[PDB]
Tab-separated table of C-alpha atoms and ligand atoms in Angstrom:
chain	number	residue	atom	x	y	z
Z	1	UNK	CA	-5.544	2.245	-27.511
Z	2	UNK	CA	-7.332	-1.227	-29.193
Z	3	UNK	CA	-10.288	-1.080	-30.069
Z	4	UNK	CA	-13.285	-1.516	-27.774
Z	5	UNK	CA	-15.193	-4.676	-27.990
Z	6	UNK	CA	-17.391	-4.777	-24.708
Z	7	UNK	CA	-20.445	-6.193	-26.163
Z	8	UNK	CA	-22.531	-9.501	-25.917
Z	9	UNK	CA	-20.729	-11.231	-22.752
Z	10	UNK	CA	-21.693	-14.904	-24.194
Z	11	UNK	CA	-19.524	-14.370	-27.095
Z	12	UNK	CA	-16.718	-13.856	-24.629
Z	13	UNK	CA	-13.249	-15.184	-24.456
Z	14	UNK	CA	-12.050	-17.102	-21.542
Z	15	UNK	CA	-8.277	-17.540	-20.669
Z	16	UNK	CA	-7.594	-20.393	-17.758
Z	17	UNK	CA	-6.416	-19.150	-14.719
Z	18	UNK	CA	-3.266	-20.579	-13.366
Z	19	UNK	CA	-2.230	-20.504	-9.424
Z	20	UNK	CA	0.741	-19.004	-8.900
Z	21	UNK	CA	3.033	-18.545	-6.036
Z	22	UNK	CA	4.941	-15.523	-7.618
Z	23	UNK	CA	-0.498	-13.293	1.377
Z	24	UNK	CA	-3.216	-10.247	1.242
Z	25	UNK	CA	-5.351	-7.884	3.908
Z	26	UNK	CA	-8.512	-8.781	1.662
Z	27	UNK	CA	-10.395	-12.350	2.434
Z	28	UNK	CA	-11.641	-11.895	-1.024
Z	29	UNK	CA	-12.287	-10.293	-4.509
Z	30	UNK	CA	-14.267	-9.644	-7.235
Z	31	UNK	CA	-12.325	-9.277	-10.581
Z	32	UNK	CA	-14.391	-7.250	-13.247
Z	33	UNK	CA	-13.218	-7.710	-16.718
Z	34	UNK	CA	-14.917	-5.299	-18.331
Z	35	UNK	CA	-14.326	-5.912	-22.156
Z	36	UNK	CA	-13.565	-8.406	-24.654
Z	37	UNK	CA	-9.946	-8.183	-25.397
Z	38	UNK	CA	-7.180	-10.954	-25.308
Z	39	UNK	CA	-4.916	-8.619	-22.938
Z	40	UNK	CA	-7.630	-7.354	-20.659
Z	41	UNK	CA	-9.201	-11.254	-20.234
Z	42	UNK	CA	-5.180	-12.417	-19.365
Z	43	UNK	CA	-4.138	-9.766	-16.435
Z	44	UNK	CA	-7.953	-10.789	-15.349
Z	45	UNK	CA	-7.045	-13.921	-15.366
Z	46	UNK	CA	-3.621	-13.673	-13.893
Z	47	UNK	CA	-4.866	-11.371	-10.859
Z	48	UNK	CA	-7.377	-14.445	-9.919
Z	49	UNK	CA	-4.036	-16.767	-10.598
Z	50	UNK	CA	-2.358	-14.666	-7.353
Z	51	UNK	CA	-5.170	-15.402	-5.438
Z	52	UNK	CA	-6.908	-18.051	-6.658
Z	53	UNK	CA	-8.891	-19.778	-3.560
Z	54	UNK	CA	-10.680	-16.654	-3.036
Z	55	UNK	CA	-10.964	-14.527	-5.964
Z	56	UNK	CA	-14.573	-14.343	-8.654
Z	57	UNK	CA	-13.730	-13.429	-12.023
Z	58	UNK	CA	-16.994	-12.157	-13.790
Z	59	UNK	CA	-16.725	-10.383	-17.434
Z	60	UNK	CA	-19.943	-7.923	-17.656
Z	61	UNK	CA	-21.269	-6.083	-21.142
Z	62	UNK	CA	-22.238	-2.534	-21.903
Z	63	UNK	CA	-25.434	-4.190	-21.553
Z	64	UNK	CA	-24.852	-5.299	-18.369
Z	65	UNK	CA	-24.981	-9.035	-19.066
Z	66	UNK	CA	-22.162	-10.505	-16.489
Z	67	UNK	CA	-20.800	-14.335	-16.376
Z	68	UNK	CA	-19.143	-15.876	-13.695
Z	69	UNK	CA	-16.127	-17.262	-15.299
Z	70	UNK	CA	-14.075	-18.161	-12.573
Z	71	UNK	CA	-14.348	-18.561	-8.975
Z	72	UNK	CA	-17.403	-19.566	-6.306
Z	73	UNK	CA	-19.238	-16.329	-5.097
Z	74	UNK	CA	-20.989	-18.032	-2.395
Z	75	UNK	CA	-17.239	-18.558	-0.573
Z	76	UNK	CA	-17.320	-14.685	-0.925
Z	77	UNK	CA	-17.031	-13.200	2.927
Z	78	UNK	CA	-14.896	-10.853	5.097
Z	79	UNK	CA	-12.936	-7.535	3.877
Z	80	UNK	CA	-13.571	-7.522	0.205
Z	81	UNK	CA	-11.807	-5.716	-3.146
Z	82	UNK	CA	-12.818	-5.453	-6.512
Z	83	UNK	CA	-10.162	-5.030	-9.051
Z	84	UNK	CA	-11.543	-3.618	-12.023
Z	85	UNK	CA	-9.905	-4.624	-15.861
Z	86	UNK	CA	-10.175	-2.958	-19.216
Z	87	UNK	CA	-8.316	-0.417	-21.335
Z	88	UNK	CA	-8.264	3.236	-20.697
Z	89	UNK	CA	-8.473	5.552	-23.108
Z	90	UNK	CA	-8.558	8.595	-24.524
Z	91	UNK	CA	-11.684	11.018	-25.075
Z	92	UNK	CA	-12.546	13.330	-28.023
Z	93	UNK	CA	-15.370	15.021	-26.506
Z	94	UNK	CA	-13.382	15.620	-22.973
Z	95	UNK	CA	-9.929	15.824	-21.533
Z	96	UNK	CA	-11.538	12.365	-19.111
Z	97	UNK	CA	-10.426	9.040	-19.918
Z	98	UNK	CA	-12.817	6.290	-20.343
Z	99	UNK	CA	-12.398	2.789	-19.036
Z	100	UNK	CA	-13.647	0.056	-21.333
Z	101	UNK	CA	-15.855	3.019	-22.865
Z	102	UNK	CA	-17.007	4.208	-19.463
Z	103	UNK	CA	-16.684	7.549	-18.036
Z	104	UNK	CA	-15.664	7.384	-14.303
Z	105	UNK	CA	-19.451	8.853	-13.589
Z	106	UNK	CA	-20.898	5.863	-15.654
Z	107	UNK	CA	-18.577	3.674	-14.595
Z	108	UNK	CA	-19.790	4.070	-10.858
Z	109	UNK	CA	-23.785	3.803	-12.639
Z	110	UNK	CA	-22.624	0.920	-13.316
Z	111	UNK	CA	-21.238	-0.776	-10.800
Z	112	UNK	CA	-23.448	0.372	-8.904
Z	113	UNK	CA	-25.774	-1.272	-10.847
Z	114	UNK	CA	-24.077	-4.383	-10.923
Z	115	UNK	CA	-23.488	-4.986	-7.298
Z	116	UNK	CA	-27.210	-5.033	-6.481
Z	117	UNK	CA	-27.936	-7.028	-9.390
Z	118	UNK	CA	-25.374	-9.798	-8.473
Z	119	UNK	CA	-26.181	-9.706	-4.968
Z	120	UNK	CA	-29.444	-10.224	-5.285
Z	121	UNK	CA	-29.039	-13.880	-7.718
Z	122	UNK	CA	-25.889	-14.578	-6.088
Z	123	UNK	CA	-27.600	-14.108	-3.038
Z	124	UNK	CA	-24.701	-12.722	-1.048
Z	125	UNK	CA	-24.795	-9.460	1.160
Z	126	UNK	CA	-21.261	-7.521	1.301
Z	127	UNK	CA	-19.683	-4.409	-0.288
Z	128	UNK	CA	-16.004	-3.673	-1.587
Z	129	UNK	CA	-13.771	-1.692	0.658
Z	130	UNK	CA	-11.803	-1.036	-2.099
Z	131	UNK	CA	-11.647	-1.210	-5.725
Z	132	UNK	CA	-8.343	-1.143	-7.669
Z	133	UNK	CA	-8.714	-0.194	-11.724
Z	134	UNK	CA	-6.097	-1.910	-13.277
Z	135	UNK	CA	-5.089	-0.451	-16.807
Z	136	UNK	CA	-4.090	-2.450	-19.445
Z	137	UNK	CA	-3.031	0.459	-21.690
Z	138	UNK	CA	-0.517	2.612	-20.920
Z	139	UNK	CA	-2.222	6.169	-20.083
Z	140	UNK	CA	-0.269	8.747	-18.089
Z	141	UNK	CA	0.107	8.727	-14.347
Z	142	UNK	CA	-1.787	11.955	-13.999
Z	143	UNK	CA	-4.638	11.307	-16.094
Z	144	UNK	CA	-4.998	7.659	-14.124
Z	145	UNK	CA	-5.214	9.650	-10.663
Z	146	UNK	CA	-7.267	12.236	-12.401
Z	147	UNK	CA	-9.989	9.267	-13.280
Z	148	UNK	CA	-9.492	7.275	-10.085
Z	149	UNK	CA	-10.511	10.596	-7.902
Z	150	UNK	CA	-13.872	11.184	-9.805
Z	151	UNK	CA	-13.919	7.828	-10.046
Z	152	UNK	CA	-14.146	7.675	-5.835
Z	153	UNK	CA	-16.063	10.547	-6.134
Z	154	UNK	CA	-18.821	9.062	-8.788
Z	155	UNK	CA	-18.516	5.720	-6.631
Z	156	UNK	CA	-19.885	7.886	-2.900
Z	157	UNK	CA	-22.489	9.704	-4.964
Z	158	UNK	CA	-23.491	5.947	-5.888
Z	159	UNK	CA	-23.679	5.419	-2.434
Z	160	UNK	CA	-21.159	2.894	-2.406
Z	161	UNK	CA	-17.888	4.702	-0.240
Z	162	UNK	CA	-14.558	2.897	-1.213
Z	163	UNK	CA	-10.521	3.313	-1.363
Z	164	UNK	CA	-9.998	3.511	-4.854
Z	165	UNK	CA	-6.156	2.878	-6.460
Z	166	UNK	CA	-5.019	2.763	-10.249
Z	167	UNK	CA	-2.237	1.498	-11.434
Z	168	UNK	CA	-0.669	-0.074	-14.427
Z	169	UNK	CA	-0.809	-4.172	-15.525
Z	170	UNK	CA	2.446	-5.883	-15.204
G	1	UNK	CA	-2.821	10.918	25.958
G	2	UNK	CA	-1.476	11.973	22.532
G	3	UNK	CA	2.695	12.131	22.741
G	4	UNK	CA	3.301	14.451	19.582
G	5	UNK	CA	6.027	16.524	20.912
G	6	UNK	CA	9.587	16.639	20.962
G	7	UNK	CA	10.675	13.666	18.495
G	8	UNK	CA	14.768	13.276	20.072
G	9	UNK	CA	13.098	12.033	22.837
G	10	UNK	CA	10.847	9.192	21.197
G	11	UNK	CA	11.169	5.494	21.623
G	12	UNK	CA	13.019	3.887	18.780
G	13	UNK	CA	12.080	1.716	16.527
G	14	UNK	CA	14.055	-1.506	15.982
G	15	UNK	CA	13.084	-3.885	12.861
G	16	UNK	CA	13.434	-7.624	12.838
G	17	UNK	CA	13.499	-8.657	9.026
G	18	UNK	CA	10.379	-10.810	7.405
G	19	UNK	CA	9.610	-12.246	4.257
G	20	UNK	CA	7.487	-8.115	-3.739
G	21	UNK	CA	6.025	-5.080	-3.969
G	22	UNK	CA	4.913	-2.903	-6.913
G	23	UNK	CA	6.639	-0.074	-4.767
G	24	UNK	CA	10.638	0.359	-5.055
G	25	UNK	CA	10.387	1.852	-1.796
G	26	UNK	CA	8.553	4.067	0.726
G	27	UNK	CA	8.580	6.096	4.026
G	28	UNK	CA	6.760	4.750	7.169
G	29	UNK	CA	5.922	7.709	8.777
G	30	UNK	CA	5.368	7.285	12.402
G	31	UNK	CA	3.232	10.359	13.561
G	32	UNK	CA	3.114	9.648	17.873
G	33	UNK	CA	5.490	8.369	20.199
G	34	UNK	CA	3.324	5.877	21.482
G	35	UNK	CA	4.734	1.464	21.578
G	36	UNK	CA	1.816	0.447	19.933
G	37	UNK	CA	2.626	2.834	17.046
G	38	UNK	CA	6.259	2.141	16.876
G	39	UNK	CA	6.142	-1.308	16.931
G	40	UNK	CA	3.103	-1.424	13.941
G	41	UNK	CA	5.793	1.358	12.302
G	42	UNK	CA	8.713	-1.310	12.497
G	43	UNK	CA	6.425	-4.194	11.572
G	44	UNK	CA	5.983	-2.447	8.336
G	45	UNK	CA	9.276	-1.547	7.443
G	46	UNK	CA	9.889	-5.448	8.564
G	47	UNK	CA	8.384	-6.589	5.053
G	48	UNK	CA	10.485	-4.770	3.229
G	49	UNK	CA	13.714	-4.171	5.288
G	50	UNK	CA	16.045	-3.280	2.471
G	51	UNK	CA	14.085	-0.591	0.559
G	52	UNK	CA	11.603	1.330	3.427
G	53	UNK	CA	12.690	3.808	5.651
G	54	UNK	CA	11.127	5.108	8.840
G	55	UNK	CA	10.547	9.031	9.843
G	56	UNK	CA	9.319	10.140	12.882
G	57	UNK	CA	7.805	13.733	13.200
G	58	UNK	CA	6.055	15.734	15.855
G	59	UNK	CA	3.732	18.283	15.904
G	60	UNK	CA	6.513	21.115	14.980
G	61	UNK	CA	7.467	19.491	12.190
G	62	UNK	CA	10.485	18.280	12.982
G	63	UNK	CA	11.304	15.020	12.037
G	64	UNK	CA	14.246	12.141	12.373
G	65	UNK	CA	15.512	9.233	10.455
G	66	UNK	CA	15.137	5.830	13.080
G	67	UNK	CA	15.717	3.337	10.256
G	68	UNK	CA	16.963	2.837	6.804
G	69	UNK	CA	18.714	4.691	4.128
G	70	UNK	CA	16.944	7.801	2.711
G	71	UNK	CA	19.511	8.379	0.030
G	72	UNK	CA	19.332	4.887	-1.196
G	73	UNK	CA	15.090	5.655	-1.754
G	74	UNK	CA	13.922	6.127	-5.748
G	75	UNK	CA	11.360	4.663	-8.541
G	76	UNK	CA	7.960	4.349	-7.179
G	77	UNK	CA	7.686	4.895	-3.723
G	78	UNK	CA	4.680	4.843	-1.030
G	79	UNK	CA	3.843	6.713	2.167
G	80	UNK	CA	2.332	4.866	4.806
G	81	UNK	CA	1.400	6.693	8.110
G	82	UNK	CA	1.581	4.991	10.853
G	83	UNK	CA	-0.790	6.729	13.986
G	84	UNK	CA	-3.874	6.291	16.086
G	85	UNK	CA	-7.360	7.258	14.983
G	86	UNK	CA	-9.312	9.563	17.766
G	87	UNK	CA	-12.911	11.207	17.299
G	88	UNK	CA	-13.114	14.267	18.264
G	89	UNK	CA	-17.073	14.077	19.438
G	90	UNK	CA	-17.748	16.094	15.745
G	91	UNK	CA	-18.553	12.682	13.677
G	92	UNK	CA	-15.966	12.929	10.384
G	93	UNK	CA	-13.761	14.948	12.253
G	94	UNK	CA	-11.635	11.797	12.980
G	95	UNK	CA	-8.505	12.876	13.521
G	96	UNK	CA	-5.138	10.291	13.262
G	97	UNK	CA	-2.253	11.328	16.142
G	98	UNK	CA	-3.830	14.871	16.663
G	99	UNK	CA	-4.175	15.861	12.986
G	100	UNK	CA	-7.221	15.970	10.850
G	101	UNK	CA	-6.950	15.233	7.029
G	102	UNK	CA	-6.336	18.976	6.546
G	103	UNK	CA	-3.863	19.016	8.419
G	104	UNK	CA	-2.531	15.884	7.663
G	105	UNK	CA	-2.203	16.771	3.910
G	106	UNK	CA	-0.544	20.387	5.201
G	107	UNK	CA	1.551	18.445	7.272
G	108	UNK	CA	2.735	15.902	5.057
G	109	UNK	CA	3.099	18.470	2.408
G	110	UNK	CA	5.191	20.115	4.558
G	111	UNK	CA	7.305	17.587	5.824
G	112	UNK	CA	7.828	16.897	1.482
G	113	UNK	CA	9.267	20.369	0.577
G	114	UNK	CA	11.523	19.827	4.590
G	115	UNK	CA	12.688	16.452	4.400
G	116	UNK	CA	13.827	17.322	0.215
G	117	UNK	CA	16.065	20.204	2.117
G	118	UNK	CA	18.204	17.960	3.810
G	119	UNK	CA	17.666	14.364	1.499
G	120	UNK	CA	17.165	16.012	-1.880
G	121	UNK	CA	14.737	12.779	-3.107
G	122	UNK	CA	11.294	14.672	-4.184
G	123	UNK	CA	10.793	12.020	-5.264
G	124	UNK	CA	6.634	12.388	-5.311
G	125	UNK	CA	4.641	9.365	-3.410
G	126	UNK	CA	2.530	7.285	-5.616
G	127	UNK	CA	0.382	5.670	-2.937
G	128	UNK	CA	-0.537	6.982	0.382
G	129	UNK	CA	-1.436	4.123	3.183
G	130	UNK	CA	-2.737	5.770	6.301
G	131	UNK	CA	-2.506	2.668	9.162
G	132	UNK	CA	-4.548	3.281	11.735
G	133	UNK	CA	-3.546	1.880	15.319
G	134	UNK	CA	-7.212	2.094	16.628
G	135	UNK	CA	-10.297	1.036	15.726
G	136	UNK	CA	-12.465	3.416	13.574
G	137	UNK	CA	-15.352	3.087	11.678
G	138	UNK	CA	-15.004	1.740	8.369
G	139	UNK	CA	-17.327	5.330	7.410
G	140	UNK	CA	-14.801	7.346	9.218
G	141	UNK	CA	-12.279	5.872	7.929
G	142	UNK	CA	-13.429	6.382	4.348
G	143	UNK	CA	-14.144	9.651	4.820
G	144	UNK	CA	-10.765	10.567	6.459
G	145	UNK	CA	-9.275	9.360	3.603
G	146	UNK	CA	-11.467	10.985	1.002
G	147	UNK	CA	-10.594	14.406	2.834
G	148	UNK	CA	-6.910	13.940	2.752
G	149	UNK	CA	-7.367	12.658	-1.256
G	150	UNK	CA	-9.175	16.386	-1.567
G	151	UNK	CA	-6.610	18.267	0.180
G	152	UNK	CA	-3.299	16.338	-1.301
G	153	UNK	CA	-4.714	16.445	-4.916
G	154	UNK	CA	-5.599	20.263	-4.837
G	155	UNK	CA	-2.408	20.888	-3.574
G	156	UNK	CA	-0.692	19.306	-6.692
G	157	UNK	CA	0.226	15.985	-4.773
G	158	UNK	CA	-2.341	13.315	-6.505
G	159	UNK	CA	-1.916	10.033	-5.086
G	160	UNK	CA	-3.577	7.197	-4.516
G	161	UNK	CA	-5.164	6.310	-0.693
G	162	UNK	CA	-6.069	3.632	1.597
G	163	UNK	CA	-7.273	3.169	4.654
G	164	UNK	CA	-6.894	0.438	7.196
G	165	UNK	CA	-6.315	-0.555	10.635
G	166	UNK	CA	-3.241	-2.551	11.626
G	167	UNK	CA	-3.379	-5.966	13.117
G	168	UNK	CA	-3.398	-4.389	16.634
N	1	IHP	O1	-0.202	-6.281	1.999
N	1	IHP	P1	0.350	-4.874	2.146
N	1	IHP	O2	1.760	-4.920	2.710
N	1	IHP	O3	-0.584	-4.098	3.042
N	1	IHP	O4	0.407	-4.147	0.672
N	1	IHP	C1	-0.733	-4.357	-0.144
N	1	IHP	C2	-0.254	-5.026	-1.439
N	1	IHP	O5	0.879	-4.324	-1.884
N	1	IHP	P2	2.276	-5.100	-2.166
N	1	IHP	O6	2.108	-6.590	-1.910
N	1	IHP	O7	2.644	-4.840	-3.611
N	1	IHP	O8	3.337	-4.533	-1.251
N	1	IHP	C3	-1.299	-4.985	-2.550
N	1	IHP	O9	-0.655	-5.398	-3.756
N	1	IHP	P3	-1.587	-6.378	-4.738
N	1	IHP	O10	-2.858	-6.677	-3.958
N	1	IHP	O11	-1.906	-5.646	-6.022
N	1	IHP	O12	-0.881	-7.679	-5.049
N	1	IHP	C4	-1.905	-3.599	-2.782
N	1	IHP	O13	-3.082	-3.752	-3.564
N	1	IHP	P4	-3.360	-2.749	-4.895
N	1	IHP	O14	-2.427	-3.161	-6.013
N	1	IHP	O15	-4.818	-2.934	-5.322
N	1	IHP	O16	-3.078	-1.285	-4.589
N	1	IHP	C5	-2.334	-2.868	-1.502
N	1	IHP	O17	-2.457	-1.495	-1.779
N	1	IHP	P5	-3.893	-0.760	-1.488
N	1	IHP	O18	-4.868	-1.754	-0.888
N	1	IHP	O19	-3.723	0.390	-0.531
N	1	IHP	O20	-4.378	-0.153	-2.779
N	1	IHP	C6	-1.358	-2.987	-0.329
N	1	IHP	O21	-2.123	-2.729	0.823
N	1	IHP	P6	-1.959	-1.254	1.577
N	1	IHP	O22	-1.014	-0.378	0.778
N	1	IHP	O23	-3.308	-0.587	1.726
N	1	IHP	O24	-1.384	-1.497	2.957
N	2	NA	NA1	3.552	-4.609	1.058
């Protein structure tokens, strides 16, 4: 896969998000781009595009700096989804595959992490019914389901409970 | 009352058209004969009325075509099953049209390896929508579908699930 820039948020680059024509069961979203690459910060950006009156796009570092880049989080309410956006790739101390550089355990950590923290300056009080990871590299269909069911797993021993699908960017 | 049994004899399911998907195609798979179910099973297939077909099976196992072209089903396809939620006064033992997640995942398994005998598609589901024609807890609900994840994936059939009620 590219290489894995997912440091210093600030730095980051921000594509515009066009509205787009071409109806969902969520009221809203949270889109999490979770590194610094062109591709990754486009099918961000395009996701919010499908939905763009009620979708939050907010890039976040391995530090666990986050901006808000798109989107009003206080218009945040009813059934929400996060979608999830970075690279997956390959592991040479594991057969897992690591999102953005995250482990499906950390990953959870860290979201975990990141919900309270944006919750509490956001000041908003709701939780994701589901989360979708959305892969912008090509990794196999087995080894996506394989990270997306410890993913779910990590995610309820987090004690955050959530659908969880993976599938490949358009 | 839970109507499981004896499919030939279950109301049919007629589909008026409405107006993609990342799915080529899928199976609605109605699980009771009940009208709530089948008209929430024909709604769905109503989205996509050229590429979904409908199944209904009872608690045998036997199943029947009610709409659409099974032959005509192939690329990525998803499973949505179409029932009603019940508790069964043992708190995650929610069970949808009679069947626990278990059982659901035995079931559907089953109705795989059946329905290839006569269609020849095994053509393995990518996505796995359970539709839930009563209300249940959103826990219950979770935890239904993290059962069936547990069963389906150990039993070499990883997918991805979601659970949801339908709009009635
Ligand atoms: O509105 P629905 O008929 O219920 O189908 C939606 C829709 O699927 P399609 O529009 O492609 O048919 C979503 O697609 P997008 O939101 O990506 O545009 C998909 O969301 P995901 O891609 O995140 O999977 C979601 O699937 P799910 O929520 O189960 O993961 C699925 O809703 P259901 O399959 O649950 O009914
Ligand atoms: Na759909």
């Amino acid at each position: 896969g590219s290489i894995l820039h997912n440091q210093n948020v600030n730095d980051w680059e921000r594509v515009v998000v066009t509205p787009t024509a071409d109806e969902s069961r969520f009221d809203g979203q949270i889109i999490v781009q979770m590194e610094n690459d062109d591709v990754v910060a486009k099918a961000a950006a395009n996701l919010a595009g499908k939905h763009p009156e009620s979708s939050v796009v907010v890039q976040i570092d391995s530090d666990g700096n986050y901006r808000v880049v798109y989107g009003d989080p206080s218009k945040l309410d009813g059934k929400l989804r996060w979608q999830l956006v970075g690279h997956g790739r390959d592991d040479s101390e594991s057969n897992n595959t690591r999102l953005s550089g995250y482990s499906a355990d950390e990953l959870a950590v860290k979201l975990a992490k990141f919900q309270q923290s944006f919750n509490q300056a956001e000041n908003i009080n709701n939780k994701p019914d589901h989360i979708s990871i959305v892969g912008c590299s090509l990794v196999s269909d087995d080894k996506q389901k394989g990270f997306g069911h410890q993913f779910i797993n990590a995610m309820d021993a987090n004690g955050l409970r959530v659908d969880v699908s993976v599938r490949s960017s358009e």
